[PDB]
Design a protein around this ligand. Structure first.
Ligand SMILES: On1ccc(F)cc1=S
Ligand SMILES: [Zn+2]
Length: 258
């Protein structure tokens, strides 16, 4: 009886194994666009992904992770609200059963069809495992997906999902360029929060881009053919793997833009 997204093991249950689920800096949150404060002192965000080395794609039973070689400063996030250098370790998505839901963050209570999380760890802590124990350990770049035109830079991800249908399957996934997943604008909201899955550690500077990317109905349909279950278990479609909005409590969302 492990955590999941079902009636018996979903987000309303997580607090029993992970009591920080009811903590002071949980994620995601609703972004109230009229309450977020423009902070003219935020530096421009620096996304340096030209030397990014993708290695592998994994179905972990909750999502799929596209994993990167994080053994050198090859794909880094810097600037914006961040002090120092954060190394890209993986990206994943959260998505719905229907185009009307799927994102974790909301914007004036609007739910997008999906949300991309590019996960980076603070190099001052040496590895990801130590970084997640620090209040400034991670920087997650959050990008909303809406359904419309195809995102060409996503198709290589969509085409390998057949090969990782069930929990614990992986596949070689070299030479994937995550720059093909970014929108034009790097305008963002930022606030201190958490992982959105167990163990829900309060180690994340969230950087949520204002501009969504467009993906095709056919692209998100392929996300929804994945399985939470392992091979030769009853089929449970990997859908609605999103945590809903948590209490803002004593936190200020800042906007990089007027
Ligand atoms: O869901 N998830 C899992 C790992 C991680 F580092 C960040 C997030 S958002
Ligand atoms: Zn996530």
């Amino acid at each position: 009886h492990h955590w999941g997204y079902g009636k018996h093991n979903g987000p309303e249950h997580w607090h029993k194994d992970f009591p920080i689920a009811k903590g002071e800096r949980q994620s995601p949150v609703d972004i109230d666009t009229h309450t977020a404060k423009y902070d003219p002192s935020l530096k421009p965000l620096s996304v340096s992904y030209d030397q990014a080395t993708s290695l592998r794609i994994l179905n972990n039973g909750h999502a799929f992770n596209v994993e990167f070689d994080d053994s050198q400063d090859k794909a880094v996030l810097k600037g914006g609200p961040l002090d120092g250098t954060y190394r890209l370790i993986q990206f994943h998505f959260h998505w719905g059963s229907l185009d009307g839901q799927g994102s974790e963050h909301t914007v004036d209570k609007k739910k997008y069809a999906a949300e991309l999380h590019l996960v980076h760890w603070n190099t001052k802590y040496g590895d990801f495992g130590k970084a997640v124990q620090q209040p400034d350990g991670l920087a997650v770049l959050g990008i909303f997906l809406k359904v419309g035109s195809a995102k060409p830079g996503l198709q290589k991800v969509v085409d390998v999902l057949d090969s990782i249908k069930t929990k614990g399957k992986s596949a070689d996934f070299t030479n994937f360029d995550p720059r093909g997943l970014l929108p034009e604008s790097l305008d963002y909201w930022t606030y201190p929060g958490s992982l959105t899955t167990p163990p829900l550690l309060e180690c994340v500077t969230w950087i949520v881009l204002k501009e969504p990317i467009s993906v095709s109905s056919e692209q998100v349909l392929k996300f929804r053919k994945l399985n939470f279950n392992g091979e030769g278990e009853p089929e449970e479609l990997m859908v609605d793997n999103w945590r809903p909005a948590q209490p803002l409590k004593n936190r200020q969302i800042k906007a990089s833009f007027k």
